[PDB]
Amino acid sequence: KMRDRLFFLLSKYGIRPRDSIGQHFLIIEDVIEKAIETANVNENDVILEVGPGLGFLTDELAKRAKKVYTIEIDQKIIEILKKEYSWNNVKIIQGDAVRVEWPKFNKVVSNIPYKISSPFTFKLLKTDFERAVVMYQLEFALRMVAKPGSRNYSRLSLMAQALGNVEIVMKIGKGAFYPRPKVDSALVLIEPRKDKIVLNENLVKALFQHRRKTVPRALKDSIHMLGVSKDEIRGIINNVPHSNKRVFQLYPEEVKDIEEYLKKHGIIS
Numbered sequence: 400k401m402r403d404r405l406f407f408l409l410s411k412y413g414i415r416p417r418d419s420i421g422q423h424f425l426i427i428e429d430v431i432e433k434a435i436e437t438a439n440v441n442e443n444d445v446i447l448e449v450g451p452g453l454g455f456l457t458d459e460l461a462k463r464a465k466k467v468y469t470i471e472i473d474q475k476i477i478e479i480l481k482k483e484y485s486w487n488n489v490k491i492i493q494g495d496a497v498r499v500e501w502p503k504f505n506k507v508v509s510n511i512p513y514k515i516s517s518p519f520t521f522k523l524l525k526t527d528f529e530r531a532v533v534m535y536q537l538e539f540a541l542r543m544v545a546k547p548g549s550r551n552y553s554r555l556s557l558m559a560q561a562l563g564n565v566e567i568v569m570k571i572g573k574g575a576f577y578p579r580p581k582v583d584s585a586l587v588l589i590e591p592r593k594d595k596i597v598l599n600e601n602l603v604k605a606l607f608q609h610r611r612k613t614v615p616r617a618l619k620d621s622i623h624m625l626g627v628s629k630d631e632i633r634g635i636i637n638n639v640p641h642s643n644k645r646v647f648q649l650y651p652e653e654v655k656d657i658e659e660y661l662k663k664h665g666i667i668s
């Protein structure tokens with residue numbers, strides 16, 4: 400049925416899906432219903448959506464939320480949304496979601512275009528939001544929920560899990576989109592922690608530059624003789640918390656220990 404509505408609109412408006420901007424439209428209603436339901440959308444919520452496409456998720460959000468902001472890069476798609484729908488409570492913003500200024504919202508409920516997965520997510524993690532329910536390329540989702548010590552645990556994994564509980568709610572087959580992409584998707588829930596861990600970006604980048612290294616080794620390669628001599632640096636590294644771990648095995652809390660330790664010895668400010 401939603402599939403039927405897609406084919407109706409494609410020929411009604413002469414839409415040519417563009418792969419330059421990864422145009423793959425969700426056509427499985429169960430996936431939209433699961434997103435909405437996970438998001439627990441209520442009449443007080445202000446929702447951010449990226450890449451509304453033909454508006455199938457947008458429409459479900461508009462009927463339940465106080466307001467939806469939706470960011471769309473394709474001007475033609477915007478014109479179609481304006482003609483096809485009549486919402487009283489949706490503001491369409493034109494631009495690349497990675498570049499434009501975001502409005503204030505408390506929840507994101509969105510398909511995420513494959514090509515902006517990383518910059519969208521890092522931008523999101525620097526925002527105040529109560530809940531995020533976002534569809535990612537499966538491989539990127541797996542990266543986001545990867546555990547410390549796993550092969551794909553990376554800076555993204557750490558920063559996202561530092562901010563929130565991150566989990567995969569469902570896998571979404573490629574057959575769920577028209578045109579059919581070459582990758583699967585996953586629905587990801589991000590539940591911001593009461594106990595938010597806020598980590599120094601510079602420490603994290605330095606550590607994760609070579610994340611297979613032991614913590615002492617990565618610190619040895621990052622610490623300069625800036626208000627601290629060679630022997631002082633050797634003393635500092637000798638007593639670093641979590642000296643027995645490699646970087647890729649660190650929880651957010653353990654990075655925080657290293658950060659607080661470096662702060663007390665003068666190395667960060």
Ligand SMILES: CSC[C@H]1O[C@@H](n2cnc3c(N)ncnc32)[C@H](O)[C@@H]1O
Nearest residue numbers: 422423450452471472473495496512
């Ligand atoms: C549903 S496929 C992605 C949808 O988001 C749009 N889109 C793709 N890339 C971006 C982006 N960087 N910012 C906003 N919308 C985007 C596409 O035009 C399509 O409607």
Ligand SMILES: Nc1ncnc2c1ncn2[C@@H]1O[C@H](CO)[C@@H](O)[C@H]1O
Nearest residue numbers: 601602605621622623624625627666
């Ligand atoms: N002695 C230092 N004082 C201040 N910042 C430093 C010092 N040594 C390294 N840093 C910065 O902190 C990062 C994490 O250790 C390093 O890559 C570097 O940018």
Ligand SMILES: NC(=[NH2+])NCCC[C@H](N)C(=O)O
Nearest residue numbers: 628629630631632633634635
């Ligand atoms: N590695 C050196 N610079 N050695 C010279 C003596 C350093 C001195 N024993 C110290 O620990 O402060």
Ligand SMILES: O=S([O-])[O-]
Nearest residue numbers: 415417473475476
């Ligand atoms: O694909 S957009 O140009 O409607």
Ligand SMILES: O=S([O-])[O-]
Nearest residue numbers: 641642643644653
């Ligand atoms: O290796 S750390 O947890 O002590």
Ligand SMILES: [Cl-]
Nearest residue numbers: 421422513580
């Ligand atoms: Cl694509």
Ligand SMILES: [Cl-]
Nearest residue numbers: 458459461462
């Ligand atoms: Cl409706």
Ligand SMILES: [Cl-]
Nearest residue numbers: 619620622623
């Ligand atoms: Cl050095």
Ligand SMILES: [Zn+2]
Nearest residue numbers: 400402403406
């Ligand atoms: Zn059909």
Ligand SMILES: [Zn+2]
Nearest residue numbers: 418421422580
């Ligand atoms: Zn594609």
Ligand SMILES: [Zn+2]
Nearest residue numbers: 432433436437
């Ligand atoms: Zn249900």
Ligand SMILES: [Zn+2]
Nearest residue numbers: 458484485486
């Ligand atoms: Zn409607």
Ligand SMILES: [Zn+2]
Nearest residue numbers: 536538539582
């Ligand atoms: Zn890949």
Ligand SMILES: [Zn+2]
Nearest residue numbers: 608609610611
């Ligand atoms: Zn390396």
Ligand SMILES: [Zn+2]
Nearest residue numbers: 621622623624
């Ligand atoms: Zn140096």
